[PDB]
Structures are given as C-alpha cells and as structure tokens.
Design a binder for this molecule. Structure first.
Ligand SMILES: CCC[C@H]1C[C@@H]2CC[C@@H](O2)[C@H](C)C(=O)O[C@@H]([C@H](C)[C@H]2CC[C@@H](C[C@@H](CCC)N(C)C)O2)[C@H](C)[C@@H]2CC[C@@H](O2)[C@@H](C)C(=O)O1
Ligand SMILES: CCC[C@H]1C[C@@H]2CC[C@@H](O2)[C@H](C)C(=O)O[C@@H]([C@H](C)[C@H]2CC[C@@H](C[C@@H](CCC)N(C)C)O2)[C@H](C)[C@@H]2CC[C@@H](O2)[C@@H](C)C(=O)O1
Lengths: 222, 222
C-alpha cells in the first residue's frame, strides 16, 4: 500500500530456504514461462518481500539456472537388457518428457550451460553408458551431441506444436485436412514422394515421432 | 503528427509488393527478433502506412510465415560422390546455417509448420535423396525426423550460445576456465569420464560440434 516507506521511518525479515524459492519459481515458470517470472510476484507467492529472495540469488538469471537443474531427470535406470541402446533411449526420453513438461527450459540451456548437480549426474550416466559400449572419446562426443541435440530439437518443435494445438484445438489429421486445398496444389510441383510424406504425417503423433526418430538414430551407432 | 486525422476530414495509398514487404520484414526480424517486428515500424521502413501492409497479409502472423519460407535454403546440390549421405549432410548443413543466420525462425517452425514453396522444395529434395537410397516409408520418415530435429536442436542451442557469447564476449575455453573452480569440485562426485568430457569440450566449436554430430548420426543409417 502507498506510504509504507514513510511508516518504515517509525520502525521485518522473512527467511526462506533456497529450495523453497526454486520450487516456487518452477511453478511460476510452468504457469507462464520466463516472462511470468517476476521477482516481486515470486516473493508475493511466498508471502515475502523481494529481499527474502536476494539472500540466496544475486539476480533472476541465477534463479533460472537453479530452476533448470531442479527439473532435470534422474539418471536412467540401467535396463539390464544388455543393450546400451535401450539405456540411451530411456535417458533421452526422460529428458524429452521433462522438456515438454517444462518447456521454458528449452531455449535457456544454450545460453546457460546446464552444469548443476542433477544435470551433471544425468550426463555422467549417458557418458558411462557410451563408454561401457566401447565408444572412443571422439565417437562418444559425436554420439552424445547427436542424442542431446536431437532431443532438444524434438522437444522445441513438439512443445511449440502442442502449445499451438491447445490454443487452436487442432490435431495433425485436422491440420492436414484444413491445409489440403493449398497442399494439394503446392505438392503437384514435386515428385510423388512429397505428397506421400505429407499424407503419412496426418497419422503421426508426438510420442511416436520422437521415439521413431530416436530409434532410427541410435540403431546405427557403433 | 497529432491532429492528422482531423486534416483527413478536409481530404493517400502507397502500393507495395508482397515480396518487398517480406524482404523488409526479414531485415527487421534479423535486427531484433519477433518482438522487433511491429507493423507500424515495418510500414515506416517502407515509407508507408500500415494499410499498405494489409492489402497483402491479414495479420503479422501471416507475415512471419512468409518470412520463414523466404529464407529457407535452396535444395542441396547433388554431390555426385555417389554417397547419399553427403547430399543429406549438405542439405542439413545448409538449413543449419540459415537457422543460425535467422534465429528468430527456430522457435516459430513448430507452431507454424513450414509448407511454403521454398520449404516444400527443400524437403522434397531430402525425401528424394532418401528414397533413391532405398529407404522404406517408415524408415524414411524416421530418418527424416532424426535429421531435421537434430538440425533444429543444434541450431537452437548454438544460436543461444552465440548470442550469449557475443554479449559476454566469452569463448568455450574461457567459459570452462571461469567455471573450473565449481566444475573441479562438482565433477569429483562422478567417474573420470565426466571430467574428461568437460575438458574436451573446451576445444570444441560450433561448426565442428554440428558437423561431428551430423556425421555420427548419418554414418549408421541404412
Ligand atoms: C559451454 C562451452 C562448451 C559447450 C558449447 C555448446 C553450445 C551450446 C551447447 O553447448 C549447450 C550450452 C549445451 O550444453 O548443450 C548440450 C546439452 C543440450 C545440454 C543438456 C545436458 C547438458 C550437459 C552439459 C555438460 C555436463 C557435464 N553441457 C554443458 C554439455 O548440456 C549438448 C550435449 C551440446 C552438444 C555438445 C556440447 O553440448 C558440448 C561439447 C559443450 O559443452 O559445448
Ligand atoms: C503439422 C502436423 C504434422 C507435423 C507435426 C510435427 C510437430 C512439430 C513439427 O511437426 C513441426 C511443425 C515440423 O514440421 O517439423 C519438421 C521440420 C523441423 C520442419 C522444417 C522442414 C519442414 C517440412 C514440413 C513438410 C514439407 C512437406 N514439415 C511440416 C514436416 O518442417 C520435422 C521434419 C518434423 C518431424 C516429423 C514431423 O515434422 C512430420 C511427421 C510432421 O509434419 O508432423
């Protein structure tokens, strides 16, 4: 309320834990993205004033990095199937599903390298899966980049699609149908394989798209 | 200037071409991203009023989709090496470099499926490269998703890194050095392979990261 600064002249800390703050920041991020994270509103959600936050972080950017690590998946459960490909796919899939659930993190990782404890443990597990499969260092690094950059690109694309699909309320089949008048005309300038791809796309879904691409990619490594 | 609406009472179209508008929109997008694209400022950059724009598009969203297609790369030059892998890599690399140069498009594609003419031709060329390599339809679709989702994720991550690197003026080697005090402590909770990966990362670069991951990924297809 206006004038409280003057009342302070005639004479209130609210200690918080960092963990409690980060959990509250994840909730605000999940609700409205990086723009929905304002420090004063975060402090309000914890019944506190902004000073309570800055005992623990210097800036909002610090808090974004803590939030990124907080939601990183546990290392994948070693599958026992004896195929390291199954373990790689579990680890990538776990990360994919986290990214879809917390899509604000996707764009942040490239400019805020994830090296917090949960990210280090997950990455260490992927690295060990590949080493125990006798990848040399250069091959390991290449395969790791393929797996992670595939997963990030898939998450970005599918999260963007899902957000638009929610708004417009439109499935893949419905979108192909709505665009059919254009697509029928435009694909006639190219060989049959293009229209055929577009037809098949009407029956695809997020989980299958991600899984099939991941399977394909990992199939041939080694 | 204020009051011009009243002067209109006592008595000016500026025809533009759609192509001219789209080129000007790409320039504004390249300068400042999707937020730097305001219709009035776009019209100002063309010495026109907003009405000139809306003869050609209904909304700014239409203009974003035209801009996405306008910058799509030409289909890759068939390499003649007789290895379809070389042609796939040229096509993916061309798209990667476009995405880095026009990074505003990366997040838009998932919610605005690229089906304009330039995107259709590029995609048709990738599809034909794979068919002529005797991929069946399900395998073709999987490989295509792997290639495109790898390229998008790499572009997102590397563009984010480059934007942060420009600002802070910091190389990969310098970043590993600045974080070394933390990383030395944090990687001691895990096997040697983790610290070794981090050390190797100091000598990586955008072009090599992208190429090595792409090579690795395509190596094993078939
Ligand atoms: C910071 C300077 C070096 C850096 C610069 C490149 C530009 C952009 C890219 O990193 C981003 C920052 C990024 O990390 O993407 C990761 C991945 C998506 C995320 C998710 C797991 C997490 C693991 C950690 C490592 C834990 C020990 N991260 C730092 C490698 O990272 C993904 C594996 C990419 C591909 C290869 C590259 O990382 C390696 C060589 C690297 O670290 O390159
Ligand atoms: C619109 C409903 C169907 C749709 C829903 C999924 C969710 C998100 C993803 O599309 C986005 C919209 C997207 O297009 O990503 C593409 C790719 C990155 C960009 C860049 C080249 C351009 C090619 C065109 C096709 C030209 C004939 N695009 C529409 C496939 O697209 C990439 C290949 C992904 C992986 C597979 C999937 O597309 C196919 C099956 C598809 O179209 O799924």
């Amino acid at each position: 309320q206006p004038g409280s600064i003057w009342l302070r002249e005639v004479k209130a800390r609210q200690p918080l834990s960092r963990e409690q703050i980060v959990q509250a920041a994840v909730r605000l991020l999940d609700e409205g993205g990086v723009r929905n994270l304002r420090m004063r509103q975060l402090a309000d959600s914890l019944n506190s004033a902004p000073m309570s936050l800055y005992w623990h972080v210097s800036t909002k950017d610090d808090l974004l990095e803590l939030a990124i690590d907080a939601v990183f998946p546990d290392p994948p459960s070693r599958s026992g199937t004896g195929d390291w490909r199954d373990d790689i796919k579990a680890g990538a899939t776990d990360l994919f599903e986290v990214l879809l659930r917390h899509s604000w993190m996707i764009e942040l990782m490239g400019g805020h390298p994830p090296v917090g404890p949960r990210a280090l443990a997950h990455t260490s597990a992927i690295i060990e899966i590949l080493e125990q499969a006798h990848f040399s260092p250069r091959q390991l690094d290449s395969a790791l980049s393929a797996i992670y950059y595939y997963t990030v690109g898939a998450a970005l694309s599918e999260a963007s699609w899902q957000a638009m699909a929610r708004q417009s309320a439109e499935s893949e089949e419905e979108w192909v149908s709505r665009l059919g008048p254009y697509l029928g005309m435009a694909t006639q300038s190219h060989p049959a394989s293009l229209a055929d791809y577009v037809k098949r796309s009407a029956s695809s879904s997020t989980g299958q798209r991600f899984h099939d691409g991941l399977e394909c990619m990992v199939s041939g490594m080694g």
